[PDB]
Write a protein that binds this ligand. Structure first.
Ligand SMILES: [Cl-]
Ligand SMILES: [Cl-]
Ligand SMILES: [Cl-]
Ligand SMILES: [Cl-]
Ligand SMILES: [K+]
Ligand SMILES: [Mg+2]
Ligand SMILES: [Mg+2]
Ligand SMILES: [Mg+2]
Ligand SMILES: [Mg+2]
Ligand SMILES: [Mg+2]
Ligand SMILES: [Mg+2]
Ligand SMILES: [Mg+2]
Ligand SMILES: [Mg+2]
Ligand SMILES: [Mg+2]
Ligand SMILES: [Mg+2]
Ligand SMILES: [Mg+2]
Ligand SMILES: [Mg+2]
Ligand SMILES: [Mg+2]
Ligand SMILES: [Mg+2]
Ligand SMILES: [Mg+2]
Ligand SMILES: [Mg+2]
Ligand SMILES: [Mg+2]
Ligand SMILES: [Mg+2]
Ligand SMILES: [Mg+2]
Ligand SMILES: [Mg+2]
Ligand SMILES: [Mg+2]
Ligand SMILES: [Mg+2]
Ligand SMILES: [Mg+2]
Ligand SMILES: [Mg+2]
Ligand SMILES: [Mg+2]
Ligand SMILES: [Mg+2]
Ligand SMILES: [Mg+2]
Ligand SMILES: [Mg+2]
Ligand SMILES: [Mg+2]
Ligand SMILES: [Mg+2]
Ligand SMILES: [Mg+2]
Ligand SMILES: [Mg+2]
Ligand SMILES: [Mg+2]
Ligand SMILES: [Mg+2]
Ligand SMILES: [Mg+2]
Ligand SMILES: [Mg+2]
Ligand SMILES: [Mg+2]
Ligand SMILES: [Mg+2]
Ligand SMILES: [Mg+2]
Ligand SMILES: [Mg+2]
Ligand SMILES: [Mg+2]
Ligand SMILES: [Mg+2]
Ligand SMILES: [Mg+2]
Ligand SMILES: [Mg+2]
Ligand SMILES: [Mg+2]
Ligand SMILES: [Mg+2]
Ligand SMILES: [Mg+2]
Ligand SMILES: [Mg+2]
Ligand SMILES: [Mg+2]
Ligand SMILES: [Mg+2]
Ligand SMILES: [Mg+2]
Ligand SMILES: [Mg+2]
Ligand SMILES: [Mg+2]
Ligand SMILES: [Mg+2]
Ligand SMILES: [Mg+2]
Ligand SMILES: [Mg+2]
Ligand SMILES: [Mg+2]
Ligand SMILES: [Mg+2]
Ligand SMILES: [Mg+2]
Ligand SMILES: [Mg+2]
Ligand SMILES: [Mg+2]
Ligand SMILES: [Mg+2]
Ligand SMILES: [Mg+2]
Ligand SMILES: [Mg+2]
Ligand SMILES: [Mg+2]
Ligand SMILES: [Mg+2]
Ligand SMILES: [Mg+2]
Ligand SMILES: [Mg+2]
Ligand SMILES: [Mg+2]
Ligand SMILES: [Mg+2]
Ligand SMILES: [Mg+2]
Ligand SMILES: [Mg+2]
Ligand SMILES: [Mg+2]
Ligand SMILES: [Mg+2]
Ligand code: NA
Ligand code: NA
Ligand code: NA
Ligand code: NA
Ligand code: NA
Ligand code: NA
Ligand code: NA
Ligand code: NA
Ligand code: NA
Ligand code: NA
Ligand code: NA
Ligand code: NA
Ligand code: NA
Ligand code: NA
Ligand code: NA
Ligand code: NA
Ligand code: NA
Ligand code: NA
Ligand code: NA
Ligand code: NA
Ligand code: NA
Ligand code: NA
Ligand code: NA
Ligand code: NA
Ligand code: NA
Ligand code: NA
Ligand code: NA
Ligand code: NA
Ligand code: NA
Ligand code: NA
Ligand code: NA
Ligand code: NA
Ligand code: NA
Ligand code: NA
Length: 237
RNA sequence: UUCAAGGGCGGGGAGCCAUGUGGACACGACCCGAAUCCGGACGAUCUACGCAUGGACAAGAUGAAGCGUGCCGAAAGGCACGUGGAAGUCUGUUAGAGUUGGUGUCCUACAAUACCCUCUCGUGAUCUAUGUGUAGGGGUGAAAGGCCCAUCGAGUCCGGCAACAGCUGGUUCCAAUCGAAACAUGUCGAAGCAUGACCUCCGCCGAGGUAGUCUGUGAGGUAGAGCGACCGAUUGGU
RNA sequence: UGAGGCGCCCAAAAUGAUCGGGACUCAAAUCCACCACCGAGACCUGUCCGUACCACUCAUACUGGUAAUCGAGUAGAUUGGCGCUCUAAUUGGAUGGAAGUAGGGGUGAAAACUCCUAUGGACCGAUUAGUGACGAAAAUCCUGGCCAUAGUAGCAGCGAUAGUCGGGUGAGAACCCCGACGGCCUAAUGGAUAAGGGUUCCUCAGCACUGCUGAUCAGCUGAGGGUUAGCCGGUCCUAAGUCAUACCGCAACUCGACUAUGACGAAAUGGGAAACGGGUUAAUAUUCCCGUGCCACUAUGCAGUGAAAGUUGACGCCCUGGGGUCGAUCACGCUGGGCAUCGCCCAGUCGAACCGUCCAACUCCGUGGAAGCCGUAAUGGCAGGAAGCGGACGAACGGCGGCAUAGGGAAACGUGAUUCAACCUGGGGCCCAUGAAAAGACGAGCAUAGUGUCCGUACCGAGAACCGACACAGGUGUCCAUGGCGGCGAAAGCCAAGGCCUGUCGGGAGCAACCAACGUUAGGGAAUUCGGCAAGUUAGUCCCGUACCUUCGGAAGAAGGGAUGCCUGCUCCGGAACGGAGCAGGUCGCAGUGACUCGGAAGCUCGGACUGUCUAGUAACAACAUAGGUGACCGCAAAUCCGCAAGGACUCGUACGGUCACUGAAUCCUGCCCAGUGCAGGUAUCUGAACACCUCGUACAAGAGGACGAAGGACCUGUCAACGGCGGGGGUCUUAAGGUAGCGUAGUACCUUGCCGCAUCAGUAGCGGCUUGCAUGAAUGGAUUAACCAGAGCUUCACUGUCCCAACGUUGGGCCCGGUGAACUGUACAUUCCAGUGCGGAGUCUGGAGACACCCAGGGGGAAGCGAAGACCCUAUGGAGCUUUACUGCAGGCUGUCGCUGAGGACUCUCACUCCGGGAGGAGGACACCGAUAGCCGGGCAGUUUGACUGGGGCGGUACGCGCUCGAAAAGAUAUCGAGCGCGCCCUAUGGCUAUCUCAGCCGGGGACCCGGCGAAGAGUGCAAGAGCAAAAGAUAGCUUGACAGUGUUCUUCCCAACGAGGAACGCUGACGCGAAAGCGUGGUCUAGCGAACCAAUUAGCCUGCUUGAUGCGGGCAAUUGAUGACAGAAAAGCUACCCUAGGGAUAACAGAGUCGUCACUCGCAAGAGCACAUAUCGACCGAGUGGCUUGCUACCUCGAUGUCGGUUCCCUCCAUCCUGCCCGUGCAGAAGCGGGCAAGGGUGAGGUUGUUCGCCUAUUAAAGGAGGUCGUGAGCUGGGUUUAGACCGUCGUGAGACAGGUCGGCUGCUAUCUACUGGGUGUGUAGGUGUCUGACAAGAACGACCGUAUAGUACGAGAGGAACUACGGUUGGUGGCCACUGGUGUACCGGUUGUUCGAGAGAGCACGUGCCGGGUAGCCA
């Protein structure tokens, strides 16, 4: 047959790429020699085309002007701080060690200095539960308990834009406009609506998948489609 | 080979080379004939989808939120009027896009997809110019196996290549002699082969042969007939 | 009363009857005899030829002889010869004329040889031996040329119908030019341009080419000429993105991703230093000239120390205010023009860049001090300080002044206003969407001077300059969107400016038929049709008014009702409009949205929620998408995906993410099943590879075995919004459950037109109810649903030429004429018709009939017409796409092991290595990554296979290897999917031998046993069938292992007649058994019970392995065992309607043909009933037939195609007669019937459901018959159904996909050569003329039928009821003709009237070939 859509994706052609040239900034925690002295002032609040969420423009003491992953509650004029000795207020960034347990956090680093990897989408947040000299236990938005180096930096507060998912798109056109700002091919044709040559579920006198939808983890690309290594399906039980 | 016996193969000197010619096998193999498969290249001037930068949409209708005023109310708010001008909203041959019916005209066309009337959309998932990206078992696809330059259930060009076929077509001067088989055995075999039958030509052998009839010595259970001769059918009566 | 001969009845078919025809009757028939003739290539006979043989011979050279016993022939075998090229030897010809060609003479059976004459003008042979790109009628053969076709089609069709009269030039003028008149184009047919073209531009000279005709013209031909830039573009910048170098990869590169660097990337249409006005050429022009202005750089000078922060460049979508120019319009004046019943109408009234100046909006400052005011179109603003007042900053392509006694104008060379494109500047709203960048500019003064190079520049820009082969009705971007009237309008219609008469052939006929577009049609009004297809109706605006339903938005312009012009005078809103809304009065028409523009409406059902997408080119839909619902995977060093690698997309992303799937808005809901399959988790035990390890083996090694055991599997569990399932039976079984809410004859229901109801005269339709559902059902989503829809079905009102039933007219063709000028097609012949025959579908054969030739027009009956090597079907050891638990492999994932890899069955560490960090350092860590290998998964991908037989193929079957009886025709052989039926073993005895013995069955005496008797065989002998057997081949007893080893002969397998395995018969050699012995035993009494090579194992001995010896382990001779049943041996599944090729009428579907079981009809006999009575009527059984309409069979004809069903239209026919005429019988009173005979003249109609044929139903009727003509009729129509590609449902399948199931959508080519006929001409024959006739023959349905009245309330009859002859009147169908009458048309004509233009008036053009409306003569018509 022919390569399935999931395979056309990997080639990285225009249709599947994100409109990167249209994006604003790569949100990452600033690098501080040490001391924490680094502070800056919020100069403006902008829309982030790559996240459909707000982002904050900050002017730092040493002249640096960078966009920041903005938590909820940050406004023009506010003074944000980044460092070990940073105050403990929303919008500030400091290592999980210096953060008091029980505080909501966002843009958490996977490993100290990577600039932030977890909890960055609209309205989400991580939960610093346990401390230690060796391990900082954080509960990610998926609900997982993650063990992180207490040296991993994070930002106090929940990400701005919460509740975005509460409103329905209502019409195809609205999805369209959002999809145009992401690295995604849309709309989506169902596999069962295709021909056998184009998809493992394609073909037939009526529409239905050929075999069962749960596919093995070991299935090769071109065949791994449907419910991937599903531990279970449906809702019952 | 073999206790043994019995079998197999060979044996009393003709070959080698040359020239012409009959035939076989490999090769293009008497000639043409088609759908393939594979390799390397050339194409996104068409078209699909994405991206960059530009452009386009008479006029009218309906009248969302918001806001105002007035009246009612303790408040909550409610009601009326106005304002406001939303919408993959309506009408619309504005421009522009599309293409339902006529199964009209055309059908050696004006045209290898045209003409006319009718019809759908026309502020949006909109239409469009130019630039730009994705390339062949690969793209692209709101998915019709659609589209990738009149080419698509795997583009185009050249090459492999004089592809192969048991299948169709064709195979060019005169005469004399003989003269079939359309059957049997085997076959992935029944549109084909091989081996026999049968046709023909050459060399050898050297006296019988037997298509006809008669007679003699033998073989035979079909026609017919019959079954108180088997067998099995098949009537009635004392 | 028996028999015979000939005939008769029985006896019906489709274009025109037949015995071949004519025609024949004491025969030209038939039967019995007879006589004479005709008549082949046979037979006889003369001569010759060939072939074979004989004599002679070297001879196959002669000569003679023989053939009664020689003379046909496809495929094929054999043999002699003719012709072509060039070579060689030998030898000739030719300018006193070679070859070739044309015509002609001679020879040879012939291939072919040769001569003569003409032409030709230089080469040409013969013999012998060679040579070979050596011989054509054919291949839908190749190339070239040519005829018919044909002076034919086209040069008409398009909403752009375009010309005409004079004149100019010229050899020549319908189309080249001038004038007038008449028209066409208005977002274009005008103006400016991008791309693209490339000289097409201008001039002169031309017409052989091109130009749909002609041409003096030209985009043609030839020759010259033409494009001028500091301030228009390029150039410069950067965009998506591209390239180059470096690095790395790769076997390698012209290959490849990342990361650096550098460069490239925008001519209309991104950003951007600077130009305006006039003038000029045949052709350029912000480029040249004149005038004026401006920018940048550099130099000089003065000023200036400032100078880089910031601003700008620089930005989305929607609504909106203000500023404001051009344009347009209004008022008034001036200048010029037009008109001439008024006094109107038209044009103009000008003047740049630039320099200077002015400034609304926004923002801000001071003052002020609002507690309710301020302000807007709207939102809004304020004690955090409103209004007012004063001030800073601050706009136009705008105002104003200069520029300008510049320029331009014949002249005047204006002033105000409104609405205001451009341009400027604000306010508001929206985003799960956030709307470039860089160069550059500003910031940052002035004088003077110098410099400003390089590339582009013509023209077209399209119904002739571009792409489409063309001067192609197609395609192709931007700007002018502000010309007038009109009106909502960038709409229509009309008209300016500007352009054009080149969407480039004309002339003629009242101009016929027929065709394309189209107008109008009385009365009826969907009767048409699959279906209202097509056409029509409605229509603009205002007022009134508006149902069910609903997601409260909508439905809605629902529906329905009314109004609408002009003129006179006014009112209101507003600053006003040349803006809008009203009032009163007058008044005309058939009609006031008067043309134009401009909805028909309502209801029920199905589907998909909606806008959107799609098969470029037959499908626009119910299919795809969608929001919404849901499940799955993943914490980012992730999940998913691309790459061989280096690397990469997702990702400037991070679970409110994004990947992978299913369902498909809302509403109410979404039951039961985990057995199978899938996925996932767990797992004592079982299974589970390689390395390392242990044992055996080998001086080593191969190899055998063990221990350990990863993933995986077994096993257990979870999971269905995972694949999917939800029955039979009874008051459980398969296999887990056993169909819940719902819905239901469904787009799913076979039976089926289900039943009931609604509706209609009538309704296979539609809707509602019922519903046992062939075979409904819950995210394979169920039900339901407002809104929406070029989606499917149905109903109503309205409408109407769809129909009854057609007519007239309009325009373009058609027809005739000038000019231009193809194609298709062609074996030949061809004036055919009716029959027959033939490979069964003939212009050509046969018999007849008809037929004088040529030509014009026509509609297409035939040439199984032309077009296409059939798409259907089968066949091929064909192809391809697709599928899967087909075969075999290959990626990829998981997992063990080895290397990298290090220190001290579980553990720590750090040093490689990996990741994070700028670094310091942090995390991880001998793991991971990578390299190698092993096991598991693995249609993700590749290559292939998937057999044959067969009354086509498939399904079924196996007649695919064997044995018997019959078929089988008394030797042998013999077919079918022929009839009956068996074998793929079983047996250590059920083998072998010997001894003893005789069986079934019946009878008699004491179904066991005992005795006797009869008893040739019916018993028994393993198993089919047939055969054999009695002191045995059977039974009993005993003994024995010959069911032995080796090797042959022969037959069979395979008749004849080659062929293996296998089988059998009969020997021998050896060894045995039994018997006194002869002898028997080569398994079972005989015919079924069977298997190659390669490989392995096994048996006994021997041969052999590369210089050699020893050991190990191999190779071989003979043979046994292991299976290929498709059985003389491949290792092997499907779909294709997305399909493709080779072929086949070797083979199916359709038509034909044969048959006639089936079907239709008839006859013989006549049981029977019919109150009695076979035969008024009905009529069984059985028997004999006819037809060729149904069905089936067959496979003859066509697969290089004979176009399907149904319908329609138009023609002919048959009779087995439905009506009509004439008759017979009656269970015939009459009337009304029933049945029958003759008979085919005429008639046999209209409708409702259905694609239907058929059939059901309704009302009429004299009756509403059946059948043939290729199931008549697609070069006639239609296209509803069957049967392409799209899709849905049900069922089946793991799946692709399928269905003798349903459903929505889904194309109709061609210019007529021949023939045929309808009509029209020209000739010839009869044999100069006029007029009038004749009539061989030919055609007709020219007439068919019904109702009514008198007869008559009569005959008949109890009555009820109720005829006839004849004479009349009328109707219907058909037929021919005609137009006084009625009616239609009537783009002759006359009137009314809307819009616009000619100034008004008058009078006119256009509005599609009449603007519309009203009337309508002639003619033509019903
Ligand atoms: Cl999303
Ligand atoms: Cl000869
Ligand atoms: Cl230019
Ligand atoms: Cl405003
Ligand atoms: K055929
Ligand atoms: Mg980032
Ligand atoms: Mg919305
Ligand atoms: Mg995208
Ligand atoms: Mg979808
Ligand atoms: Mg599909
Ligand atoms: Mg597949
Ligand atoms: Mg579905
Ligand atoms: Mg489904
Ligand atoms: Mg392009
Ligand atoms: Mg309003
Ligand atoms: Mg709309
Ligand atoms: Mg519209
Ligand atoms: Mg493009
Ligand atoms: Mg398909
Ligand atoms: Mg010959
Ligand atoms: Mg001869
Ligand atoms: Mg016999
Ligand atoms: Mg007999
Ligand atoms: Mg002969
Ligand atoms: Mg010689
Ligand atoms: Mg031939
Ligand atoms: Mg002709
Ligand atoms: Mg005209
Ligand atoms: Mg010219
Ligand atoms: Mg000239
Ligand atoms: Mg550049
Ligand atoms: Mg520009
Ligand atoms: Mg010019
Ligand atoms: Mg020019
Ligand atoms: Mg033209
Ligand atoms: Mg009428
Ligand atoms: Mg009807
Ligand atoms: Mg009808
Ligand atoms: Mg219609
Ligand atoms: Mg007023
Ligand atoms: Mg009208
Ligand atoms: Mg239905
Ligand atoms: Mg839809
Ligand atoms: Mg199409
Ligand atoms: Mg459509
Ligand atoms: Mg279509
Ligand atoms: Mg759908
Ligand atoms: Mg969804
Ligand atoms: Mg979803
Ligand atoms: Mg019903
Ligand atoms: Mg369910
Ligand atoms: Mg064919
Ligand atoms: Mg087929
Ligand atoms: Mg294949
Ligand atoms: Mg790194
Ligand atoms: Mg495959
Ligand atoms: Mg192959
Ligand atoms: Mg077969
Ligand atoms: Mg015999
Ligand atoms: Mg025997
Ligand atoms: Mg083998
Ligand atoms: Mg063995
Ligand atoms: Mg065989
Ligand atoms: Mg055999
Ligand atoms: Mg074919
Ligand atoms: Mg045949
Ligand atoms: Mg035909
Ligand atoms: Mg009769
Ligand atoms: Mg008749
Ligand atoms: Mg027919
Ligand atoms: Mg007929
Ligand atoms: Mg026909
Ligand atoms: Mg046709
Ligand atoms: Mg035709
Ligand atoms: Mg149809
Ligand atoms: Mg239909
Ligand atoms: Mg249909
Ligand atoms: Mg004559
Ligand atoms: Mg007119
Ligand atoms: Na499927
Ligand atoms: Na192939
Ligand atoms: Na392109
Ligand atoms: Na309101
Ligand atoms: Na159309
Ligand atoms: Na390909
Ligand atoms: Na080739
Ligand atoms: Na082949
Ligand atoms: Na044969
Ligand atoms: Na055969
Ligand atoms: Na064959
Ligand atoms: Na003899
Ligand atoms: Na006989
Ligand atoms: Na022959
Ligand atoms: Na002309
Ligand atoms: Na106007
Ligand atoms: Na729309
Ligand atoms: Na299960
Ligand atoms: Na399961
Ligand atoms: Na079901
Ligand atoms: Na639509
Ligand atoms: Na008409
Ligand atoms: Na014809
Ligand atoms: Na294919
Ligand atoms: Na096979
Ligand atoms: Na044998
Ligand atoms: Na018959
Ligand atoms: Na044919
Ligand atoms: Na028909
Ligand atoms: Na008749
Ligand atoms: Na009917
Ligand atoms: Na036919
Ligand atoms: Na047709
Ligand atoms: Na038809």
């Amino acid at each position: 047959g022919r390569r399935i859509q999931g395979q056309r994706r990997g080639r990285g052609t225009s249709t599947f790429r994100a409109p990167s040239h249209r994006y604003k900034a790569d949100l990452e925690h600033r690098k501080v020699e040490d001391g924490d002295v680094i502070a800056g002032t919020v100069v403006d609040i902008e829309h982030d085309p790559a996240r459909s969420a707000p982002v904050a423009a900050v002017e730092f003491e040493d002249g640096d002007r960078r966009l920041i992953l903005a938590p909820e509650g940050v406004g023009v004029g506010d003074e944000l701080q980044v460092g070990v000795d940073a105050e403990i207020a929303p919008g500030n960034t400091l290592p999980l060690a210096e953060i008091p347990e029980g505080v909501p956090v966002c843009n958490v680093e996977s490993s100290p200095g990577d600039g932030g990897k977890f909890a960055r989408a609209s309205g989400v947040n991580a939960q610093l539960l346990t401390h230690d000299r060796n391990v900082a236990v954080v509960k990610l938005p998926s609900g997982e308990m993650k063990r992180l180096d207490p040296q991993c930096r994070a930002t106090i507060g929940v990400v701005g834009g919460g509740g975005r998912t509460d409103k329905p798109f209502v019409k195809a056109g609205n999805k369209h406009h959002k999809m145009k700002a992401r690295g995604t091919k849309w709309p989506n044709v169902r596999g069962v609506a295709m021909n056998a040559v184009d998809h493992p579920f394609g073909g037939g006198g009526r529409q239905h998948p050929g075999k069962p939808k749960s596919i093995s983890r070991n299935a090769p690309p071109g065949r791994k489609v449907g419910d991937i290594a599903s531990k279970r399906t449906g809702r019952g039980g």
